[PDB]
């Protein structure tokens, strides 16, 4: 029912630095065109958390909107002899890469965007851990995690993973465990906050406060086919702008509506709003929330 999933909050840039050959349809993503770093997120059921929060930012969008910092280095060369800095974090993740990707990206333990990358024209293997030779490569990067992001000033410097009975989750050793342990790949929820590391969680509990801020709207104009349109051009009631706009009841409560004189139509974005997450009993406003499938070791005997 939502026809505006490609009408992106923010700049809407779904490319990774160093892979710019599909900028025409990824920078920004919009109604028209294919984008190998974004289109996979909308395949029904593949990325269920993002699809529940699809008017929030992807990881690449959050990087280009300066909400999430890039890791140093920003891509790891999987081919390199004697290693790369991503290998430990990547190996504890169980991931499936489709064929023909040169790059795949993820939110690392420090809360920054890292990526693994193959040479030309090498593709990642199915487990995303190696490169192999391949008609032609995709021009973007495969998102390894199901997540979504938003801006936040809420300090998470005292927040840390606390998981009952867990000794290790991903690359995080949580506590001393000298007994015999059990091991499994688990799909674990996590969040990243201002000034925190990745916080893995026993349970994902989210709430959304809807509002009438700009990222709560999607605006479109007619290509002279729909085209994404920036609401910042639209005058507020009592204010000025550079364009004429119209929209739904929520839009017209705050913005001028000029009906048949409008250059664009704006409507409230389904599911948008400020997201908070419950973490060790307290609600906090995260930068990003997601799931990843990682090795987990639990106390046993």
Residue numbers in the entry: 154 to 287, 290 to 379, 393 to 469
How does the study describe this entry?
We solved the crystal structure of RVFV Gn to 1.6-Å resolution. Although, residues 154–560 were present in the RVFV Gn construct, electron density corresponding to only residues 154–469 was observed, indicating that the remaining 91 C-terminal residues were likely cleaved during crystallogenesis. RVFV Gn adopts a novel fold comprising 15 β-strands, 5 α-helices and 4 310-helices. The protein can be divided into three domains: a predominantly helical N-terminal domain termed ‘domain A’ (residues 154–305), a β-ribbon domain (residues 306–365 and 440–469) and a small globular domain termed ‘B’ (residues 366–439). Superposition analysis revealed a high level of structural similarity between that Gn structure and the one reported in this study (0.4 Å root-mean square deviation between 261 pairs of C-alpha atoms, respectively).
Rift Valley fever virus (RVFV; genus phlebovirus, family Phenuiviridae) is an important example of an enveloped virus that harbours a class II fusion protein. As with other phleboviruses, RVFV displays two glycoproteins on the lipid bilayer envelope of the virion, Gn and Gc, which form higher order pentameric and hexameric ring-shaped assemblies. While the Gc glycoprotein is responsible for membrane fusion, the role of the Gn remains undefined. Virus entry is completed upon Gc-mediated fusion of the viral envelope and host cell membrane, in a pH-dependent mechanism.
